[PDB]
Amino acid sequence: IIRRYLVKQVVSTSLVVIALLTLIMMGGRLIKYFGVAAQGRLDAGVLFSIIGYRMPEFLTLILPLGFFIGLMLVFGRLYVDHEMAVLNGSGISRIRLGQLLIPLALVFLVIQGILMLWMTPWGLRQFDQLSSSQAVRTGFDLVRPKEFISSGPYTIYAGDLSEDRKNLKDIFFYQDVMILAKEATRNVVDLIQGRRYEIYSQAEFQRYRLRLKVEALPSSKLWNKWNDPVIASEMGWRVFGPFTIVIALMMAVALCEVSPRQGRYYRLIPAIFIFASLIVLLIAIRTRISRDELGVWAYPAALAVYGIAAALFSRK
Amino acid sequence: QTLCIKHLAKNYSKRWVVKDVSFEMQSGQIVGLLGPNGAGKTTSFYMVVGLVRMDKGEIHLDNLDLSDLAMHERARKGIGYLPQEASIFRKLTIAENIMAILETRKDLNKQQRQQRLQELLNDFKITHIKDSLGMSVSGGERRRAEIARALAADPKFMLLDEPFAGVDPISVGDIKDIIRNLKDRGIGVLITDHNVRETLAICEHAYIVSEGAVIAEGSPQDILENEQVRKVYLGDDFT
Amino acid sequence: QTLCIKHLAKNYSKRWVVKDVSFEMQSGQIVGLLGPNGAGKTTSFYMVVGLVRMDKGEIHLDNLDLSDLAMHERARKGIGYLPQEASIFRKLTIAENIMAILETRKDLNKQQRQQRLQELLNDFKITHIKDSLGMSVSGGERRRAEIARALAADPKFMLLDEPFAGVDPISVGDIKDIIRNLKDRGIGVLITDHNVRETLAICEHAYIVSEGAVIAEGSPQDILENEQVRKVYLGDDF
Amino acid sequence: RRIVAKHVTKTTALAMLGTTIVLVILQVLFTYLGELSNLKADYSAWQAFLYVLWGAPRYLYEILPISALIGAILGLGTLASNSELIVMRSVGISLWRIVGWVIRSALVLVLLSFALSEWVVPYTNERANSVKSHEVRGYWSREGQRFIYVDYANSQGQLKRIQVVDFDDNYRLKSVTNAEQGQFVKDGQWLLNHSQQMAILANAAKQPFSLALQPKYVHMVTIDPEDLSFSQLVSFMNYMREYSQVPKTYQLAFWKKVASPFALITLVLVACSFIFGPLRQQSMGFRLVIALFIGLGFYYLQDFLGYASLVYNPSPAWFVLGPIVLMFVAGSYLLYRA
């Protein structure tokens, strides 16, 4: 009954924290993308597919962070409302409570293993091909109102811009051909009430038509080729990466002891930085292994250090 | 069985809150750990429970050292703890509250665990409210459920923290009956409490902890007749 | 001065914790607002102070309606509040704690403000700690400095919250003497307290609130010999 | 009243300064970790450390709003959890008076933000750029009915490959003049050599004509409008308006700069109202977590509505001063609920 109580509490609070962290972390990215889309450097209609294809990447970080934050929230709540003094006072240690959640940690480890091995590479492949499709925009696509845009041999001006990136106004185009049009609708663009000049040829018109990664490879191709340092680094990241859930469990068990007066949230900020130290160390380890400087063994090395530290701190 | 506490000590901010507190409590005996507020009775009580780490001394249970044991390691030796604040599992049913501790017992099977749960609910008159959540019960019912839950662990010594706290004179008698039942159940009870007048009404051996040290011991009549206690804690007029 | 309070009522989670609590007070009179825990004594006390917003009821102070005023607006009318918890300004000295409220007074100039911080310190025997920080004094001295600080605002009614809370039987007489001195100073006192044994020993008119309504009133002798109170709160033996 | 005023102001000011120091150190470290991935032969770890160290004033300027919010939260939470704000009310000190005392502390951070933006950030940013990477090329600009293009422009008054195109109200060509080198002597006229003009054909060894380009603002065209100081931004917007149309990305930057002290004050007021209201009796950790959530929400909302102001018709004033006014109203209402 105590295991079910803890599992339900941790699952509920961890899902709440995962939803909050997802909302925050990819709301920041979505706002940044909309900012890029504000100058026309990215289609406004694809910035939702970008977030959809980067769901596994952000979830790869959120799931360990969400599990860790939810674990410390549950254990800190148990400490604050004196449910731990009656669990310890009945013979159930805090380590024993941490061991009762090993099945839940294994379930989260399986979920994040799926994320690391299948969903993250697939989402990154899709996002990379989409971004490569979005990197070819040039000319009238990058125009901004009341400004000069230079893209290769083209110089472009727009006096006004609609809410959507169509129906240009007060258009000035430079090559050498000079084209000035009152209106232009969109590269295939129909210019309305415009004048064309050549640098001396003048041709007025009423209408005119102007016609100016290893992080995403499937694990099937990465299971072998351990010799290549980049391939080895990525494959070790996908293999030893999911085991941050177990470290997030034995670290949340260690750093959750909080007083009723201090609060349920007292120890979250100091310990989120301790977990971020592990994640940053793993990213730095990945970068160095990609340069044939550290070797694949550095992943279990860091994982085993933070643990033997979390285990020693929980057993003092 | 006897719980022997000897030469407790503990310093906070380089100030010796507790200095040489030593008392003995037997099974089936109600012992009250009283004294002036903030004079070291609460810290001594917590060192006995295990909330705060001991600095000097030793706590024994029939030539069995418990000074080095943690809170949970003492709990399997026969020491229980009842926090003053609401310590019921808020989102767990009262029957589930008692059963969560009954399932940790290694000497009971399901057929015996269910019978023990039914008996515990019946003895504390909470069988009618056994299907409600812990956070949706009255204060008296919640405290009865917590005492029933603590008995599910089968403790040999009970360390009650502030039992007559926020209790009307109508319910102080019910708490007296509960503590007397714990005594009659073969469980020694250690009581620390600010409500000295009602604490002295059930305990047959009270220890007065003043200035971090025990200054008195014996029956409540002896404590009341004591000049040292009446000079520092109880005052000239007290009954 | 009379603090008439009529038909207080407050609801929490669609449950009316207080239902028609009404009591009156006079200046220089100790009134104890007692009752079972959670029966509406704390909530009614807070609605008198102003911490808890009033759903229903009227508070008068010499035909001056304080029902719609805020906590600070009532305090400017002469209502004082002393929290149960430690409410001293931790980083200010005791003399600075008392002067911090004496500077709020508008009828006192710089010449006489020192006079009061001299008389307020001497009256409560906290002169020896006038240079010590409020966070580094004993519980009794801190409580005396808090009461002296509260009196610096010149209140007409001092609403004491749990005055005999965590107070040893040796020092309960000191709190009783402080409250009696407050009464002799022309200040009415409202006391809500779990410790009814001593609260009924200084109050000259006690109100018992049970189930959110006043179930008895009168002198402590009448309160003790009250069948409803005897059955609900005090118990047969007391 | 002075002693209570000094107590509240000093407590909240110390909390704001401590949060400022902590957040500045944390952002310096975080950016250094991010900057550690770009090291190369000519960009060593020491160079990337100096780059993030010179950017510290900019990080401070960006932190001051959220630093003030969290500082007010912590300073007033220390007072409230110690039951000091309850006894300030018990003697006759209003909620708005305490809010004004906290705003007194927030005014120090507002003045610090002003000083940084005016005199520190525009210099340390230039220092950071010079440290990292070590005049505008292909400068295209319009002056009313004339379009001028210069390949190389210098802050001392030097031009290379000048090209000016004139037009009519009906947009008809008059002369497309080209030059090789140019010099600045007075406003509205530039001396140049190899002066070749069309006529709707002419040439001249040396002759000056009217053009409104000024060397003072030539080094600002490369700088993003957000990075420009207030004086630089106002001068550049005035220069552009007197001769062309100011881009909306400059109006947005002007409105985010003129509304930063008001955003800071409103954020502090919201923090005070939360302390007196919803965040009363909560733990300090929960108060800090909620302060971080409010800071992130405000930063995201202001960034999004700045981005939304560049794509929608209404002026950026609505999108910038909108959230500030709404949050001020919400905080004032929460203060009315006491």
Residue numbers in the entry:
A (entry chain F): 2 to 176, 185 to 195, 204 to 216, 223 to 235, 247 to 350
B (entry chain A): 10 to 248
C (entry chain B): 10 to 247
D (entry chain G): 4 to 137, 145 to 210, 218 to 355
Q: Can I see the authors' text?
A:
The impenetrable nature of the outer membrane is due to the presence of a large, amphipathic glycolipid called lipopolysaccharide (LPS) in its outer leaflet. Assembly of the outer membrane requires transport of LPS across a protein bridge that spans from the cytoplasmic membrane to the cell surface. Here, using structural, biochemical and genetic approaches, we show that these antibiotics trap a substrate-bound conformation of the LPS transporter that stalls this machine. The inhibitors accomplish this by recognizing a composite binding site made up of both the Lpt transporter and its LPS substrate.
To assess whether the conformation of LPS in the drug-bound structure reflects an on-pathway intermediate, we solved structures of A. baylyi LptB2FG bound to either E. coli or Acinetobacter LPS but now in the absence of 1. In both cases, the overall conformation and contacts of LPS to the transporter are nearly identical to those determined in the presence of compound 1. These findings are consistent with a mechanism in which compound 1 binds a pre-existing, LPS-loaded state of the transporter complex, identifying this state as a druggable conformation for antibiotic development. Although the specific sequence of events is uncertain, we propose that C-helix movement away from LptFG during the transport cycle permits LPS to bind in the intermediate transport state observed in the structure of the LptB2FG–LPS complex and that this is the state required for inhibitor recognition.
